Amino acid sequence: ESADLRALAKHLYDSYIKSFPLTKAKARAILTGKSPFVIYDMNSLMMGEDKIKKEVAIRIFQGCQFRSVEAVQEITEYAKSIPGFVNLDLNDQVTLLKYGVHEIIYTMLASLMNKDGVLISEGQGFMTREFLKSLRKPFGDFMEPKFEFAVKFNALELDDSDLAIFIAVIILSGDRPGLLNVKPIEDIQDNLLQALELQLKLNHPESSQLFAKLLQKMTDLRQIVTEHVQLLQVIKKTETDMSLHPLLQEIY
Amino acid sequence: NPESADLRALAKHLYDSYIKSFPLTKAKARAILTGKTTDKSPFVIYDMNSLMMGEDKIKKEVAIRIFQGCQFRSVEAVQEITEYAKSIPGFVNLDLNDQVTLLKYGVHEIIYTMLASLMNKDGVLISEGQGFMTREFLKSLRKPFGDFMEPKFEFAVKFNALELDDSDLAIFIAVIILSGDRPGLLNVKPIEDIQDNLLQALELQLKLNHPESSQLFAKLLQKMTDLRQIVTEHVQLLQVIKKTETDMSLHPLLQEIYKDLY
Ligand SMILES: COC(=O)[C@]1(Cc2ccc(O)c(CC=C(C)C)c2)OC(=O)C(O)=C1c1ccc(O)cc1
Ligand SMILES: COC(=O)[C@]1(Cc2ccc(O)c(CC=C(C)C)c2)OC(=O)C(O)=C1c1ccc(O)cc1
Incomplete structure (x- = not known):
């Protein structure tokens, strides 16, 4: 019965590797030292x-949104590999992804961050934390809350096999508004939470209450998401030069 | 068999995304039209009083009120098709300007393909299938509005005789969007590679879903010629309206789609 949780762990690890080109293992290998081009100022x-x-x-923010849409399809593909996900009400699958992708993007973004900057373009570039802070308001305070989250998140020293299960737990959140059949969503998350628990015990025997500390980071994640939404409004309200091609506006 | 397994998974993926993107499916449309139902019976508009x-x-x-109404729903249909397109594996990875080009030329061919699902020889479902507007009433509209819908009907009765279901149409409308022959495409090869995979997906779907329908694949691909022709007539008809009805307002998104279209 513990054998099924190990099978679930391995299954999610294999699907996570297939869905996401740039793993944390790879990202960490770069960040520490095929060297990447560094963007430290306007000239760079x-x-x-x-x-x-x-x-x-504006160009940086927009570029980020284009790439974010590319990631949503990678996460959608991953979500369909979660045992029970596709058997859910189609409206509930859509709801879980609509609310879940933001939380997953910022979780996986931490894999690409240290305190000094973030890997960009599947690890081809490194944009510095200072350069992003140096953008004219309100763009200068967009990435900074994400860096703050990432520093605290990365202190857990999770690997890809851990994150694969964690991301699944995020997707299967029964508290998303507008869900029609919460029971099978909570029933799957229960099974994922059990699988995550065993994973963190076996992979990190020395790491006391890591499970508990990881679940607590959900608080930080949701604050980061609501703060981004609010800052997305300040843009939509007061930015005249944000108006893209009407058909591009639609894709985003 | 492992190769054909990946094509079944692609068809599954696309159908799933089609259900999520398009609120009014052919399956629902046909259930309303074939008049079985007591709850789903539409109100019929065939004259002014009705x-x-x-x-x-x-x-x-x-x-004008009917034409302004179709305009707004067309806009809403562009939204649904754009949301479907994002779900096609490889589409959002493509160049940004080419994504815009594929949609610009693709959405009207998709609108008329899917409008066929809502049509029989006698008329068309309106307001998410709550209403039904007769082909005769639309044809009797004041010139030149009387002949906007008739060419869509002509296409529909022929297309509808292929007897395609939603699982077929999901892969077909994907094949339409990923057209390498669109005017102004910067990188064609990556579009063609996605369409190659979609066409393989469509070919196996039509063979598995319609075993006794000879050359249905070839027959469906030929219908893309008929769609192209319907868009041309439609555009020509809009040019006449702009000049004849200066007081009538085209939607910017539709104007942007129509701007320098062939
Ligand atoms: C989970 O990771 C991601 O989704 C991103 C998307 C992305 C990809 C390539 C890029 O050049 C960018 C641009 C990143 C910035 C900070 C302008 C983003 O991949 C990244 O390498 C990266 O830095 C991402 C990203 C996503 C959202 C953000 O708010 C910032 C970065
Ligand atoms: C989903 O339904 C359709 O495709 C349309 C759109 C439509 C929806 C609701 C409507 O009330 C109407 C007609 C408008 C009024 C004010 C009675 C059209 O219904 C039609 O009869 C019709 O011709 C539609 C249509 C036609 C061409 C297009 O490019 C888009 C929609």
């Missing part, structure tokens, strides 16, 4: 465009 |  950014692929702060 | 009463029953000039 300008030259960066030759491998990054009107105003600086 | 249109007037339809205003209370369903939730300026007549021909």
Whole structure:
């Protein structure tokens, strides 16, 4: 019966590796020392465009949104590999992904961050924390709360096999508004929570109450998400130069 | 068999995303139209009085109010197709300008493909299938509004005879969006590679779902010629409206789609 939880752990690890090119293992190997191009100022950014692929702060934010949409499809694919997920009411699958992707993006973004900056373009670049802080308000305070979260999150020293199960727990949240059949969602999350618990005991025997400490980080995650939504409004309200091509507006 | 297993998974994925993106499926449309039902029975608009009463029953000039109404729903349909497109594996990975190009030229061919699901020889479901507007009433509309819908009906009765279900249409409308032959595409090869995979997916789906339908795949692909022609006539008809009805307002998103279209 513990054998089924190990099978679930391995299953989610295998699907996580398939769905996400840039693992934490890979990201960590880079961040510590195929060296990446560093963006530390406007001049290094300008030259960066030759491998990054009107105003600086707006172009960066927009680029980030384009790449965020690419990640949502990777997470959607991963979600369909979670035992029981596709058997749920189709409206509930949509609800769980709509509310879940933001929490997952910031969880996985921590894998790409240290206190000094963040890997960009599947590890091709490194944009410095200071450069992002240096953008004219309100763009200068967008990434900073994410860095704060990442520093505290990365102190848990989770690996990819741990994060694979954790991400599944996030997706199967029974408290998303508008859910029609909460029972099988909580029943799957119960099984994932059991699998995560055993994973963290076996993988981190020396790490006392790591399970508890990880679940507590959900608080921080949700604050980071609501804070981003609120700052997305300040943009929509007061930004004249944000108006993209009407058909691009639709995709985002 | 392992290769064909990945094509079944792609068809599954696309159908699943089709159900999520499109509130009114062919399956629901046909259940309303084939008049089996007591709860799903539509109110029928066939004349002015039934249109007037339809205003209370369903939730300026007549021909204009109907045309302004189709405009707004077309916009809402562009939204649904755009949401579907994002779900097609590889689409959001493509160049940003090419994503815009594929949608610009693709959405109207998809609108008319899926409008067929809502049509029989006698008329078309309106207001999410609550209403039904007769083909005769639409044809009797003041020139040039009288012949906007008739070419869609002509296409629909022929297309509908292929007897495709939603699981077929999900892969077909994906094949339409990933068209490498669109004017102004910067990188064609990555589009063609996605369409290759979609076409394999469609071919196995039509073979498994329609075993006794000879060359249904080839016959479906030929219908893409008919869609192309319906869009041209539609655009020509809009040019006439702009000049004849200067007081009538086209939607910017639709204007942007129509801007320098062939
Ligand atoms: C989970 O990770 C991600 O989704 C991202 C998306 C992404 C990919 C390539 C990129 O060049 C960017 C641009 C990142 C910035 C900070 C302008 C984002 O992949 C990243 O390497 C990265 O830094 C991401 C990212 C996502 C959301 C953000 O708010 C910031 C970065
Ligand atoms: C989903 O239903 C359709 O496809 C349309 C849109 C439609 C929806 C509700 C409506 O009330 C109407 C007609 C408008 C009034 C004010 C009675 C049209 O219903 C139609 O009869 C019709 O012709 C629709 C249509 C046609 C062409 C398009 O490009 C888009 C929608």
